[PDB]
Coordinates of C-alpha atoms and ligand atoms in Angstrom, one line a residue:
X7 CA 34.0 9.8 -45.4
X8 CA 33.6 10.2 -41.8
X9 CA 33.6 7.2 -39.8
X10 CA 31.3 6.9 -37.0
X11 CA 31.5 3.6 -34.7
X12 CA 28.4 2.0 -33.0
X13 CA 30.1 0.1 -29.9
X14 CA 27.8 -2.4 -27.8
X15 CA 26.1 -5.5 -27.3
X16 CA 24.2 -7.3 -30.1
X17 CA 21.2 -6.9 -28.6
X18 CA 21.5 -2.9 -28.2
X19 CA 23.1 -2.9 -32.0
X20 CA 20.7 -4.5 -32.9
X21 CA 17.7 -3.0 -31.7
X22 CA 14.8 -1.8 -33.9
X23 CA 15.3 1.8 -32.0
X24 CA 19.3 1.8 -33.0
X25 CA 18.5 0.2 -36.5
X26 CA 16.5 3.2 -37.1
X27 CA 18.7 5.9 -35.6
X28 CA 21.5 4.3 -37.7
X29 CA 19.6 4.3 -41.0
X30 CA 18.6 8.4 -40.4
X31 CA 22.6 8.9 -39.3
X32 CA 23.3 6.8 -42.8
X33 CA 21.7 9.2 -44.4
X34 CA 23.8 12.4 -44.0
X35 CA 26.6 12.7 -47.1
X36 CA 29.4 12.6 -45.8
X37 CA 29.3 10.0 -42.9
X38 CA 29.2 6.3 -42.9
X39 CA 28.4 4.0 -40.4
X40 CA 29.9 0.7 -39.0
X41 CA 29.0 -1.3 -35.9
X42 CA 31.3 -3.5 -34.5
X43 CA 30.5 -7.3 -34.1
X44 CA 29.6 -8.6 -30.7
X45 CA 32.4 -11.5 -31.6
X46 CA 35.0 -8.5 -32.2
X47 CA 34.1 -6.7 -29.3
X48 CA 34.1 -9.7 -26.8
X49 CA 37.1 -11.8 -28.4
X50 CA 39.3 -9.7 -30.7
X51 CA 41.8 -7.1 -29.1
X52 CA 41.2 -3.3 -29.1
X53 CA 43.9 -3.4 -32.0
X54 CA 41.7 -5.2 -34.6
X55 CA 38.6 -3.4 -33.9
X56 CA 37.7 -1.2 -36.9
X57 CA 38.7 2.3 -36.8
X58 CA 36.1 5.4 -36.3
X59 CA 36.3 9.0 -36.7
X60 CA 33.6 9.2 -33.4
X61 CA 32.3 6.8 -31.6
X62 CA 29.1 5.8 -29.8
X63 CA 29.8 3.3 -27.2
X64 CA 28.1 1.9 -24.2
X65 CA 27.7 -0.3 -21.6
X66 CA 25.5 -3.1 -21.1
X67 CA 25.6 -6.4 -19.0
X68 CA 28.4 -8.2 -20.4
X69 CA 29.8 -5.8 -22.2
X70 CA 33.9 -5.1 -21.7
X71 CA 33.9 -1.2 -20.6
X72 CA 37.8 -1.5 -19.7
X73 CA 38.4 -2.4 -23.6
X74 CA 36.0 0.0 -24.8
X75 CA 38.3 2.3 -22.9
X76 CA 41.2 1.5 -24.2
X77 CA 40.2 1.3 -27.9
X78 CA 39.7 5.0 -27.5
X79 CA 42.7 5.6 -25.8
X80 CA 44.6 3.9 -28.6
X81 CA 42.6 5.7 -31.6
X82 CA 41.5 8.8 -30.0
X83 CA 38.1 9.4 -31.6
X84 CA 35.7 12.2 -30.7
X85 CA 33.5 10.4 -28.0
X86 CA 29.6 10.9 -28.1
X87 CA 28.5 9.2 -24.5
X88 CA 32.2 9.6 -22.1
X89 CA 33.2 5.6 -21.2
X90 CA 34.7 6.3 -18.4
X91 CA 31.7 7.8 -16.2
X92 CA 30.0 4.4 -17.2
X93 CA 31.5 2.7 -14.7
X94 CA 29.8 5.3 -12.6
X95 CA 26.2 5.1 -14.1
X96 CA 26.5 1.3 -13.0
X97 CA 26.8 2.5 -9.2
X98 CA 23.8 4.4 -7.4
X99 CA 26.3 6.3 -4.8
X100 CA 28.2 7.5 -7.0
X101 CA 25.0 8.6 -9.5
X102 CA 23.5 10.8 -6.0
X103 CA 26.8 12.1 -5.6
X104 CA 27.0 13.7 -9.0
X105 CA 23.4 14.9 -8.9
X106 CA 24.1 16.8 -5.0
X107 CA 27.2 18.5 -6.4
X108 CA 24.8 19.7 -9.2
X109 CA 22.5 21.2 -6.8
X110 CA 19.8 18.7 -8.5
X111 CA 16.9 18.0 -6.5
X112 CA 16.8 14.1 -5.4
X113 CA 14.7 12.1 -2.5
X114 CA 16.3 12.6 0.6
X115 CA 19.0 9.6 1.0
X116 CA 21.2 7.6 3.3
X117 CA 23.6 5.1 1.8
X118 CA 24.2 1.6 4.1
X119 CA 27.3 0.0 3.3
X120 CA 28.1 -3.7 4.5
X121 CA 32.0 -4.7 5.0
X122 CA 32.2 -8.6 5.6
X123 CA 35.3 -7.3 6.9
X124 CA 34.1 -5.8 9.9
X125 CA 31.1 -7.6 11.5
X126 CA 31.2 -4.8 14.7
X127 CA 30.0 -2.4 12.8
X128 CA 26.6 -1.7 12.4
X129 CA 25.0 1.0 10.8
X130 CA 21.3 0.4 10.6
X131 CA 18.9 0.2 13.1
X132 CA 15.4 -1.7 12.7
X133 CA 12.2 -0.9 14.5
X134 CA 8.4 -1.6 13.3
X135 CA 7.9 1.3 10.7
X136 CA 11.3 3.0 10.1
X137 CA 15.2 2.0 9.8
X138 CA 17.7 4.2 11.2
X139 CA 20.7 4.8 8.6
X140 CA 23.8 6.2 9.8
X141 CA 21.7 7.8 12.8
X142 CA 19.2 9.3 10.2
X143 CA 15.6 8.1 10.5
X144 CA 13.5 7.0 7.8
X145 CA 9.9 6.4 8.3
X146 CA 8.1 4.5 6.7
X147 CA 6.9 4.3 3.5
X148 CA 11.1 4.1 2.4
X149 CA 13.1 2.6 -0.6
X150 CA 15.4 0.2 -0.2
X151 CA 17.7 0.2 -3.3
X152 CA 20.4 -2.6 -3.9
X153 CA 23.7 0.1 -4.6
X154 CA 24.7 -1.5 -8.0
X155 CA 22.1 0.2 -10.3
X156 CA 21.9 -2.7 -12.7
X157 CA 20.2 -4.3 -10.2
X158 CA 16.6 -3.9 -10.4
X159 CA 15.5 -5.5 -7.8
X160 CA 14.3 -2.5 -5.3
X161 CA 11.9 -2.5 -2.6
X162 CA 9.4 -0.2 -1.2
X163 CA 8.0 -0.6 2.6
X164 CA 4.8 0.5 3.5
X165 CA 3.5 1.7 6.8
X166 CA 1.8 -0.2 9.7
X167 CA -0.7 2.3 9.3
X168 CA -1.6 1.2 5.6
X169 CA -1.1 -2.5 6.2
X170 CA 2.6 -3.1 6.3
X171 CA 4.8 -5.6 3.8
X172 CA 6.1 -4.1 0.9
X173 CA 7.0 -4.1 -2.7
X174 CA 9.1 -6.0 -4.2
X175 CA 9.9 -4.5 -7.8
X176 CA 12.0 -6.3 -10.7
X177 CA 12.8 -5.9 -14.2
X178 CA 9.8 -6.7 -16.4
X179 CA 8.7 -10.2 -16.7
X180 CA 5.7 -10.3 -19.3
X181 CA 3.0 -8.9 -17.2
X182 CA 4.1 -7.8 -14.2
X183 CA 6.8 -5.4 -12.6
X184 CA 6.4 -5.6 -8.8
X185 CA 4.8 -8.2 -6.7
X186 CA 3.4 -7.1 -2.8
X187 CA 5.5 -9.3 -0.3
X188 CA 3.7 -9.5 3.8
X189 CA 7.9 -9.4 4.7
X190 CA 7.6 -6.1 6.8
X191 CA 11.4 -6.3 7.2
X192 CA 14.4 -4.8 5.4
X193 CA 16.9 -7.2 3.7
X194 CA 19.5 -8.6 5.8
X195 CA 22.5 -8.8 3.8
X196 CA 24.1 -6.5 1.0
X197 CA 24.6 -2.7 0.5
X198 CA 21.9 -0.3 -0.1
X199 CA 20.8 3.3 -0.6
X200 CA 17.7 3.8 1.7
X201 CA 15.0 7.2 0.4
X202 CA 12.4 9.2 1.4
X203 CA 9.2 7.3 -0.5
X204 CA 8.2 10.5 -2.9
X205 CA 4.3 11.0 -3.4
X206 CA 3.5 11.1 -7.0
X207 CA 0.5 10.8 -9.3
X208 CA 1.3 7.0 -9.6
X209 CA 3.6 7.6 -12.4
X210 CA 7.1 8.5 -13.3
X211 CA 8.2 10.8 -16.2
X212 CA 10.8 9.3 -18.1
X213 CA 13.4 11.9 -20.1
X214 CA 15.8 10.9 -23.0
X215 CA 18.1 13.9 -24.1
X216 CA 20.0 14.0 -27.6
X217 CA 22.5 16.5 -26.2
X218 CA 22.0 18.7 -23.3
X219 CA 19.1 21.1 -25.3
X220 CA 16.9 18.4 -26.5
X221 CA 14.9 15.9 -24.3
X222 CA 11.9 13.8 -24.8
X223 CA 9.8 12.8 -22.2
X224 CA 6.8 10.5 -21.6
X225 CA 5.2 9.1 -19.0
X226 CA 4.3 5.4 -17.6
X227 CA 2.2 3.8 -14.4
X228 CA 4.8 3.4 -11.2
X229 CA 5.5 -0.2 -10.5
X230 CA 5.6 1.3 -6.7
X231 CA 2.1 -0.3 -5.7
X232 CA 1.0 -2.4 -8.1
X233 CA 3.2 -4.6 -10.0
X234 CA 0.8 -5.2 -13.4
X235 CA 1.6 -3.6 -16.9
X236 CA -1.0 -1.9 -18.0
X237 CA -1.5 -2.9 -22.0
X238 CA -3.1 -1.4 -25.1
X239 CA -5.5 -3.1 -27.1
X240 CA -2.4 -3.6 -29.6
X241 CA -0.1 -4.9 -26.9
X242 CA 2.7 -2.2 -26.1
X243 CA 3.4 -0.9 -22.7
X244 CA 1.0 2.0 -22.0
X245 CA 2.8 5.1 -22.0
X246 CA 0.9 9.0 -21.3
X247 CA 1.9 12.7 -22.7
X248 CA 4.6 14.7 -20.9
X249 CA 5.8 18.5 -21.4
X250 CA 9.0 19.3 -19.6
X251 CA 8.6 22.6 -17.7
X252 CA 11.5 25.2 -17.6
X253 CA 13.1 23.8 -14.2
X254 CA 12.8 20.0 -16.2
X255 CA 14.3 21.1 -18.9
X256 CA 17.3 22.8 -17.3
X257 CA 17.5 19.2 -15.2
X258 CA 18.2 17.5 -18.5
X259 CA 20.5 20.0 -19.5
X260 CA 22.7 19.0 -16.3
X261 CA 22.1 15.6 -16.2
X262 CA 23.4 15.2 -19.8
X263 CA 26.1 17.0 -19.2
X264 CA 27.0 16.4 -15.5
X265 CA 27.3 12.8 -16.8
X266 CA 28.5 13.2 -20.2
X267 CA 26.2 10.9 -21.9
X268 CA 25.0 13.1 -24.9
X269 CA 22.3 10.4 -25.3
X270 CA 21.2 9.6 -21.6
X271 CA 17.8 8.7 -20.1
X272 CA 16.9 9.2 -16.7
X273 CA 13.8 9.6 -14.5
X274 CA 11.9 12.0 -12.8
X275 CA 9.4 11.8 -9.8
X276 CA 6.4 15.1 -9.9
X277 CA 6.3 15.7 -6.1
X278 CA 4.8 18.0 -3.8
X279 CA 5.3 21.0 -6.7
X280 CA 8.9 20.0 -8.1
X281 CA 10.8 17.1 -10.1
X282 CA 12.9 14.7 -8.4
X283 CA 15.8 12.6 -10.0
X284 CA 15.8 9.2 -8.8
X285 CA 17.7 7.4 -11.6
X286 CA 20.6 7.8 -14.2
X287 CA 20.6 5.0 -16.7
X288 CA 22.8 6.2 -19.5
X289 CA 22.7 5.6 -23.2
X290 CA 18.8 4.9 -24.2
X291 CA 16.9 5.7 -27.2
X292 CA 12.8 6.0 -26.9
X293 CA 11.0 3.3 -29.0
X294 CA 8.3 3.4 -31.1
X295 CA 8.2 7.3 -31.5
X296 CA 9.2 8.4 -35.6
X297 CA 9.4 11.8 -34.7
X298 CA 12.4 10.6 -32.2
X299 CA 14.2 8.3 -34.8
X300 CA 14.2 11.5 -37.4
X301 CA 15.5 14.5 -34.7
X302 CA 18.1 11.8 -32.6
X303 CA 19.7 11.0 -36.1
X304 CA 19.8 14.9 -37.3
X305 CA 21.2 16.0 -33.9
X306 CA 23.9 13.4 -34.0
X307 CA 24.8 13.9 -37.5
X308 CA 25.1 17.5 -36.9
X309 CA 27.1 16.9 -33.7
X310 CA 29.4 14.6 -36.0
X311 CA 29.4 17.3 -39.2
X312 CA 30.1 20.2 -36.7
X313 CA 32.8 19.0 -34.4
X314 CA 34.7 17.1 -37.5
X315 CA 33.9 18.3 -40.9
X316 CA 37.0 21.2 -40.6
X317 CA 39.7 18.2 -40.6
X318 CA 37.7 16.6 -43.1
X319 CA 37.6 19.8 -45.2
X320 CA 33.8 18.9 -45.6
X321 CA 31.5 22.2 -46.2
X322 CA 29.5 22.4 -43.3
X323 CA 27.3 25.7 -42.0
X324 CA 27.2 26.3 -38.2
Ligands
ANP401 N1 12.3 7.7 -3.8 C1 11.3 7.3 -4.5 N2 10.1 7.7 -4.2 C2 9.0 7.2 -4.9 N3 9.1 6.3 -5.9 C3 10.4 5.9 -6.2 C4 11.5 6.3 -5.5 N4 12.6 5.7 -5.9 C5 12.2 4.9 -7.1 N5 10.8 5.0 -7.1 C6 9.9 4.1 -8.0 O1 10.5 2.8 -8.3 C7 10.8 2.8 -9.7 C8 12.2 2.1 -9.8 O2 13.2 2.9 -9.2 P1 14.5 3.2 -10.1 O3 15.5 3.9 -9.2 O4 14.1 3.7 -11.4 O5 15.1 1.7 -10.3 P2 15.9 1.0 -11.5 O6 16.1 -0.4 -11.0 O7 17.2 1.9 -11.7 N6 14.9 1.1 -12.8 P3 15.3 1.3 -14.4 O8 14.7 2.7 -14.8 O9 14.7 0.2 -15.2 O10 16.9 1.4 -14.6 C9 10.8 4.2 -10.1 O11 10.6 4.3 -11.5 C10 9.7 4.8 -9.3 O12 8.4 4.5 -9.8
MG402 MG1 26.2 8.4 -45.4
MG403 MG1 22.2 13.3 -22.6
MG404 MG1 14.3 3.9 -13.4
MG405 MG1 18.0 2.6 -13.5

């Protein structure tokens, strides 16, 4: 049988979303799948890990992306999400970069970086209601974005003229998402990309392709403004109907394979008549949704059957 390898943290491996996926992928003929222990991963060298035909492999805190690379360097298998442009989903310069060169739309951007090496150089300048970055002006409302993108802790400044302070957002504790601070000024020490505040309905659209021609999307309130999580009568986050038009579609066809993550979220800002890209996370499956479960499994099988089931001898139609 065909071996396909499920490479990450317990807690992603282990997810209801992945348990599901993984039970659908089971259930193709010719494929079995293993996930590697946490304990392997972390504490065993590359040469013990189990051997795969493909493998799915990512990235989350604590998990050891150098030996993820060189497990796949040793045992060449056919790589679903590429390892080694994880290291540069974790940074947010080198995510805008990518999306420029692929003549993606993003919020207009300047990137501050801070040398402790060099305390002569400045590169920001502060006044009431705007920062200057690298001699470009941003007025206020801005966002202030620390440049490693697993930190979540990002802030939006408002305008004198709508009563100053900002926002300070954060990854979701319980209830809340962002909390308004009176601070009306920028943060002192660290590197950060500074945008161009992007009006939107108060939400953001959230896409998750399975390969570059297939990608959900749904949409959710904006922490931007106000910091609680709306809840259903159940309890889950609220979440509200989305339909990618042709221009977000062909975004997620480039994003997916600009980065090449076949399984990659990312998100999208509805502005002034287009769609923005203001975040790259990577490998992420949607939750909840059965409909997702069954066609992420069948497209991944069939991206398994088709690219190895001639070495395998297997009988497999286009
Ligand atoms: N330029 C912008 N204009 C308007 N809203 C923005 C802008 N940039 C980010 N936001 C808002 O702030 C939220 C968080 O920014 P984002 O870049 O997604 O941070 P993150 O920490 O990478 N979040 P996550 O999706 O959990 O990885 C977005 O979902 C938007 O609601
Ligand atoms: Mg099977
Ligand atoms: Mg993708
Ligand atoms: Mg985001
Ligand atoms: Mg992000």
């Amino acid at each position: 049988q065909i071996v396909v390898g499920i490479c990450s943290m317990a807690k992603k491996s282990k997810s209801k979303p992945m348990k599901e996926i993984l039970e659908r992928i089971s259930l193709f003929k010719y494929i079995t799948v293993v996930v590697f222990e946490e304990e392997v991963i972390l504490n065993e060298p590359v040469e013990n890990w189990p051997l795969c035909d493909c493998l799915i492999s990512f990235h989350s805190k604590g998990f050891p992306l150098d030996k993820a690379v060189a497990y796949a360097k040793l045992r060449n298998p056919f790589v679903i999400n590429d390892l080694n442009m994880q290291y540069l989903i974790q940074d947010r310069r080198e995510v805008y970069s990518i999306l420029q060169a692929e003549g993606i739309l993003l919020p207009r951007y300047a990137i501050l970086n801070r040398d402790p090496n060099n305390p002569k150089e400045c590169n920001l300048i502060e006044g009431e209601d705007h920062v200057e970055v690298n001699g470009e002006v941003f007025q206020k409302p801005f966002v202030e974005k620390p440049v490693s993108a697993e930190d979540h802790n990002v802030y939006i400044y408002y305008p004198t003229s709508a009563g100053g302070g900002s926002q300070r957002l954060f990854r979701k504790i319980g209830s809340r998402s962002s909390v308004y601070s009176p601070e009306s000024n920028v943060r002192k020490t660290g590197s950060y990309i500074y945008e161009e505040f992007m009006p939107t309905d108060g939400t953001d659209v959230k896409v998750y392709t399975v390969g570059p021609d297939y990608a959900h999307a749904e949409a959710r309130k904006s922490p931007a403004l106000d910091g609680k999580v709306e809840r259903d009568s159940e309890g889950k986050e609220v979440r509200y109907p989305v339909i990618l038009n042709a221009r977000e579609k062909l975004i997620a066809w480039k994003v997916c394979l600009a980065f090449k993550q076949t399984v990659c979220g990312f998100d999208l800002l509805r502005a002034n008549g287009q769609s923005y890209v203001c975040d790259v996370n990577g490998f992420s499956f949607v939750k909840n949704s059965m409909k997702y479960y069954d066609d992420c499994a069948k497209i991944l099988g069939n991206i398994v059957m088709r690219e190895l089931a001639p070495q395998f001898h297997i009988p497999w139609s286009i």
